[PDB]
C-alpha cells in the first residue's frame, strides 16, 4: 500500500520541486537546520530563561508529536520522492519513512505552543517558519505534500493538546 501515489500529491510535488534557483538550494540548505531536533536544546534554554511557563507544553507537545511521527512512520513505511518518483531533485539523500515529515510536525508544534497568549507579529513569524520547513522539505525532494500536510496537522494538533492540559 502506497499512499503517497494519487494525483494531486504527485502534482504538487512536481510545482514545487521544479521550481528551483540556486539561491533558493542556498537558503533552503542553510534553514533545515531551524527544523531539525538540533534547536530544541537551545530553544528550551532560552524558554526556561524568558517564557518558563511555556517550557512544559512545548515539552508534552514535543513528546507527543515526536511519538505520533514515528509510530506513523514506522507503520506505513512510506518511500520518499526519490525512491517512488523519477527525475527528483534531491538536496538530501533521504529515502524512506516518508509518511509523515517529523520536522514539519516539530516545527509546526512550537509554532502552535510558542505563538498562544503572544502578539500577532510573533504568531506571523513562528507560522511562517513552520511553513518554510514544509515547504523546505518538498523543495528538497524528501517529501511529498500529502507528508507535510498531515505532519502540519500533527504538530498543531499536539500543540493545542498540550496547551490545553
Known amino acids: 500500500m502506497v499512499i503517497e501515489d494519487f494525483a494531486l500529491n504527485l502534482e504538487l ?3 514545487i520541486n521544479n521550481a528551483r534557483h540556486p539561491l533558493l538550494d542556498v537558503f533552503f540548505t542553510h534553514f533545515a537546520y531551524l527544523g531539525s531536533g538540533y534547536v530544541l536544546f537551545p530553544l528550551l534554554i532560552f524558554l526556561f530563561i524568558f ?7 512545548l515539552i508534552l507537545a514535543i513528546m ?7 509510530s506513523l ?17 534531491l538536496l538530501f539523500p533521504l529515502h524512506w519513512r516518508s509518511f509523515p515529515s517529523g520536522d514539519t510536525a516539530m516545527a509546526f508544534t512550537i509554532a502552535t505552543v510558542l505563538s498562544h497568549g503572544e502578539k500577532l507579529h510573533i504568531k506571523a513569524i513562528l507560522f511562517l517558519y513552520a511553513f518554510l520547513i514544509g515547504y523546505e522539505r518538498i523543495y528538497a525532494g524528501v517529501h511529498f505534500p500529502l507528508d507535510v500536510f498531515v505532519g502540519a496537522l500533527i504538530g498543531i494538533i499536539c500543540g493545542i493538546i498540550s496547551l490545553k492540559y
Open 64 to 70: 507527543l508529536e515526536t511519538v505520533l511521527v514515528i
Open 51 to 57: 517564557r518558563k511557563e511555556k517550557v512544559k507544553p
Open 73 to 89: 512512520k514506522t507503520f506505513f513505511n512510506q518511500p520518499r520522492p526519490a525512491i517512488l518518483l523519477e527525475d527528483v531533485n
Open 13 to 15: 510535488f512536481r510545482l
